[PDB]
């Protein structure tokens, strides 16, 4: 029940209305990722770089398996039962992730039966088929570069250069891996890691994974850019150096009786200065309730807002009074800079601050004047069918509202400052004034 | 001296205790980095790209030498003496860095004797040896790509394509360099630059630089991910296009009589609504003093917090009183979203908001009920061992503390709002109320 007419005089012009949607109900897939390439084709000059690489990789891979083994050891069938005493400290999300891990551990037993076939692959993307019912996909980290560059050039250059090239490539791959799979990964149990982060073990090519898995939908990019496609690590092999990953693919659902409203700010003139209004730009209306939303965590499109989680925030009572038509409670800030918006267009009607900008009518060739008792000017085709501002000519529509818009006044709120140091200074000054007032109150109590 | 029993009823459940570690006492080494490759074996049709590349690189390299010369001129022996009049304006860290630069300048004189040998290198990683007691390592920026790709194909394609490929590779390298070594580098004297940023001159392969130097330790990854390995530029050559870098490698020490405590927040029930408490999640206790810590700059592991600098912060008196037992001084906030934690596990004991979530005991098959005068419920195995909260079945231990936990109440604090605009609105409202009170009390002053 926002009062748009009173808000437009403050400088808040209504914009586009959008929908609200959140994800749920995912489909699951299982994949195998290898972290070591096959160099059987060029074994003449490999040196001892592979032993050093294996030693370096083992130390990275050990803590993840150590962290998984805690939940692996304390879950058994009985729903599923967990030993609370043996775990000690946990949150709800970790418990849910552990239940999901136990459920996913069923297919890993069937996958692990093909260890010999996994260790014998020599291509970047391989499909392994045991029976017609079950198939798996294997991705190898650095096989394409070795197959394309090093092997065909094995007889034209000395092999020391080939060894140096292989060592440099392995070191670069490890440097890329350490940002994601290092000690920053404190909680591998959870299932909130995105597919983009997991793709670093394949060189950042998540498009190949998603395309090979056979996923196809109309909202593929919307799901990809809102961080809704996630993954989870379920098994690590320290002898053959591979991991097993589960991939989740959700769908989007629309929330009932909810929408989001956007406002555009335009500066206005009060006494001799420019002012702006400090009001939230995005407002969520759900059923009959008005609230805030942290839109920095969500993706904004032309007709909907897509999030992976509900992000509602409470709102104060004075702000709610301001938004419903009480303009005496809305704060304002002074303008000192020379760059600020000064007009806006809504439904073919122009809202302009003609004190700070040049306004004139194309048809009559005469300027449009604003007095000192007005904050803004509304322009439509009943008085000026065609307007010119700066170097643009605009043709206007008709306003649907009060015909006496330009002859009615309003009340203004108090000025404020929005800087951190200014916030501290204001708090200090108000405390000092309050203490002085309380001291005088004590003095009056004595008398 | 935190009062955990009273804090648990508010909704703060104690978690893991960790240690506090800070770096000190580094070891130093030095290296030479070249920024131009050797194209002697493809010189027949290199074109004229090398002259343009040199002209482009000289303009980048000049200001760094200009900035170093200021401290080079005004430092001499007397310990180490500095002319304060000729410097003019400086900070303490800059002066310490200048002293370190003067100390490091001794070995560069010995290194610069091998300029002819530095010019003649044609490999990616080279070890130059003058006498058995002094050796240096040389890294070349783009030699591997030229040696592996362009040279073997010099006769199969027209070499205008090779010219274009070389130009594109050089341009890509410069585009990568400009982010770090451009005009963003305003103070090259300091020694706070990390090895990750320095490795951009070698293409981002810091693993090769670290492993070739012979460094090896058990805290390698912890030191690497906490930004404790730094470097400093000490010499720039404009006629030969190479730089000399010094690298520092510290060790970790443990602060005595100090630890860090973590708290887990769980929403609780009051009146007819949900609330969550606003208290810092990490608390530092040093000797007998309680304080805050900005943990966003530090690395968190499963048993310790590693930082490169002390990050203690002062704390107000009211928050300390809240943490020591006075629950009437702790603020709270309303919950509007549908995603919030609702239970937690601590030492085998369950803390749950059983009004909002569904609570049942599997042993007796009977639901567990919470009255309207309780904020939370404590569940252990003295009532019934096995509990179900959903798709998870949990077995519980015994609680250590008061046996009348569920029959005792507390006092609650005042509500607050934490949004950015709400702070300004609240400040405005409080100021207006204070001004009105003073304006009225002026009349009482008159009386």
């Amino acid at each position: 029940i926002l009062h748009y007419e009173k808000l437009s005089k403050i400088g808040l012009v209504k914009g586009v209305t959008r929908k609200y949607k959140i994800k749920s109900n995912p489909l699951t897939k299982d994949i195998v990722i290898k972290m070591i390439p096959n160099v059987s084709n060029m074994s003449q000059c490999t040196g001892s770089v592979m032993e050093n690489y294996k030693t370096r990789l083992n130390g990275i891979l050990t803590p993840i398996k150590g962290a998984l083994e805690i939940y692996k050891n304390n879950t058994h069938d009985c729903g599923v039962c967990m030993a609370g005493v043996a775990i000690g400290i946990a949150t709800a999300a970790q418990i849910t992730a552990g239940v999901a891990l136990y459920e996913a551990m069923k297919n890993a037993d069937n996958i692990n039966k093909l260890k010999s076939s996994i260790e014998s692959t020599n291509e970047a993307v391989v499909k392994l088929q045991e029976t017609a019912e079950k198939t798996v996909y294997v991705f190898t980290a650095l096989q394409d570069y070795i197959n394309t560059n090093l092997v065909p050039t094995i007889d034209k250059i000395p092999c020391k250069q080939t060894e140096l090239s292989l060592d440099l490539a392995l070191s670069k791959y490890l440097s890329d891996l350490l940002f994601v799979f290092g000690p920053n990964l404190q909680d591998p149990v959870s299932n909130s890691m995105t597919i983009q982060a997991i793709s670093q073990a394949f060189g950042g090519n998540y498009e190949t994974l998603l395309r090979t898995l056979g996923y196809a939908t109309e909202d593929f990019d919307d799901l990809l850019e809102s961080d809704s496609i996630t993954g989870q690590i379920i098994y690590v092999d320290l002898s053959s150096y591979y991991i097993i990953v589960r991939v989740y693919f959700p769908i989007l659902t629309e929330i009932q009786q909810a929408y989001i409203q956007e406002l555009l700010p335009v500066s206005f003139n009060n006494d001799n200065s420019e002012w702006i209004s400090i009001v939230p730009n995005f407002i969520l209306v759900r059923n009959t309730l008005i609230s805030n939303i942290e839109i920095g965590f969500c993706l904004i499109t032309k007709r909907s807002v897509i999030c992976n989680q509900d992000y509602a925030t409470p709102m104060t009572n004075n702000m709610r009074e301001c938004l419903t038509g009480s303009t005496e409670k809305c704060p304002r800030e002074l303008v000192v800079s020379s760059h600020v918006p000064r007009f806006a267009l809504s439904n073919g009607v122009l809202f302009a601050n003609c004190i700070s900008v040049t306004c004139q009518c194309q048809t009559t060739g005469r300027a449009i004047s604003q007095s000192g008792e007005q904050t803004l000017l509304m322009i439509d085709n009943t008085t000026c069918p065609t307007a010119v501002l700066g170097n643009v000519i605009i043709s206007l529509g008709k306003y649907l509202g009060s015909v006496n818009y330009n002859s009615e006044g309003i009340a203004i709120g108090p000025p404020v400052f929005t800087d951190k140091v200014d916030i501290s200074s204001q708090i200090s000054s108000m405390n000092q004034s309050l203490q002085q007032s309380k001291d005088y109150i004590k003095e009056a109590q004595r008398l | 001296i935190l009062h955990y029993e009273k804090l648990s009823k508010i909704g703060l459940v104690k978690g893991v205790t960790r240690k506090y570690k800070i770096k000190s006492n580094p070891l130093t080494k030095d290296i030479v980095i070249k920024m131009i490759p050797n194209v002697s074996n493809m010189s027949q049709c290199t074109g004229s790209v090398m002259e343009n590349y040199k002209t482009r690189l000289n303009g980048i390299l000049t200001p760094i030498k200009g900035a170093l010369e200021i401290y080079k001129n005004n430092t001499h022996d007397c310990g180490v003496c500095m002319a304060g009049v000729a410097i003019g304006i400086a900070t303490a860290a800059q002066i310490t860095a200048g002293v370190a630069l003067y100390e490091a300048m001794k070995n560069a004189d010995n290194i610069n004797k091998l300029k002819s040998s530095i010019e003649s290198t044609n490999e990616a990683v080279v070890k130059l040896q003058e006498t058995a007691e002094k050796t240096v390592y040389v890294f070349t920026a783009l030699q591997d790509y030229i040696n592996t790709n362009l040279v073997p194909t010099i006769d199969k394609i027209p070499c205008k394509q090779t010219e274009l490929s070389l130009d594109l590779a050089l341009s890509k390298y410069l585009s990568d360099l400009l982010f770090v070594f451009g005009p963003n580098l305003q103070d090259p004297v300091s020694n706070s630059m990390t090895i990750q940023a320095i490795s951009q001159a070698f293409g981002g392969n810091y693993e090769t630089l670290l492993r070739t130097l012979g460094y090896a330790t058990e805290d390698f990854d912890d030191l690497l991910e906490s930004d404790s390995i730094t470097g400093q530029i000490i010499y720039v050559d404009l006629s030969s296009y190479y730089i000399i870098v010094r690298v520092y490698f510290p060790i970790l020490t443990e602060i005595q009589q100090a630890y860090i405590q973590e708290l887990l927040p769980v929403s609780f029930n009051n009146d007819n609504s949900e609330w969550i408490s606003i208290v810092p999640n990490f608390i530092l206790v040093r000797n007998t003093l309680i304080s805050n810590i900005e943990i966003g700059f530090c690395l968190i592991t499963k048993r310790s917090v590693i930082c490169n600098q002390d990050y203690a912060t002062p704390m107000t008196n009211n928050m300390r009183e809240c943490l020591t037992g006075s629950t009437e001084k702790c603020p709270r906030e309303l919950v509007v979203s549908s995603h919030v934690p609702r239970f937690a596990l601590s030492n085998g004991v369950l803390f749950a908001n059983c009004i909002s979530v569904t609570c049942q005991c599997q042993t007796t098959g009977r639901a567990i009920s919470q009255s309207g005068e309780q904020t939370l419920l404590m569940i252990d195995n003295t009532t019934c061992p096995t509990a179900v909260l959903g798709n998870v079945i949990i077995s519980l231990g015994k609680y250590l503390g008061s046996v009348n936990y569920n029959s005792e109440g507390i006092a609650i604090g005042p509500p607050v709002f934490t949004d950015k605009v709400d702070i300004s609105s609240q400040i405005s409202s409080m100021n207006q109320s204070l001004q009105q009170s003073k304006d009225y009390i002026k009349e009482a002053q008159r009386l």
Partner: antibody
Amino acid sequence: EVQLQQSGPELVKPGASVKISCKASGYSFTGYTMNWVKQSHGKNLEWIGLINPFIGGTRYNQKFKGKATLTVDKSSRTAYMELLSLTSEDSAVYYCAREADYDWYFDVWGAGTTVTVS
Amino acid sequence: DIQMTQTTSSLSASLGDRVTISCRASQDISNYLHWYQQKPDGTVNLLIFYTSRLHSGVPSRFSGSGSGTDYSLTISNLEQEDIATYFCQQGNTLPRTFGGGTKLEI
């Protein structure tokens, strides 16, 4: 044991509107997604739509977009489906079903409610 | 969008015999096929999900197989309470679609 209880048969005059309810017991109501299915003469099955009560989200089939409205009530653990502007072809059997967590299959079904329009 | 066709609508079998029911699809569905059974009194039960997995409480008499666009359900030595209707459902793309149904008889 988990089970779903539906309402009884009913007769509708053409042009009127109807509501059908479904009650659940033996599990946590807000932890699962609910689906509605239609079976007509000839034993063909058609999927109408789904509702998620934890977040209050809905999804519809494009064929039934203007015909059906889905609603949940968490106090009594009940689901409602409302049908609008009935004709003679809307006489059928309606099924209330629960969905599995991961894969799109239904594990628990209701008894069914028959609707006749005349 | 995706059409599911069961060619045979009625099948005749004797006690203790082996029966097979086939289900086809117009596109690749990547093993997202489920099987349902409808009793004469009107109750519906789930038998096989993800083309090879037995639901809890279902006897091991039933089995399922297939790939690509062709799938099959096999029942061995069938007994008296196996006379019902059988449906195949896909779960790869919205909207979800069902098959025609196949009726068994003695």
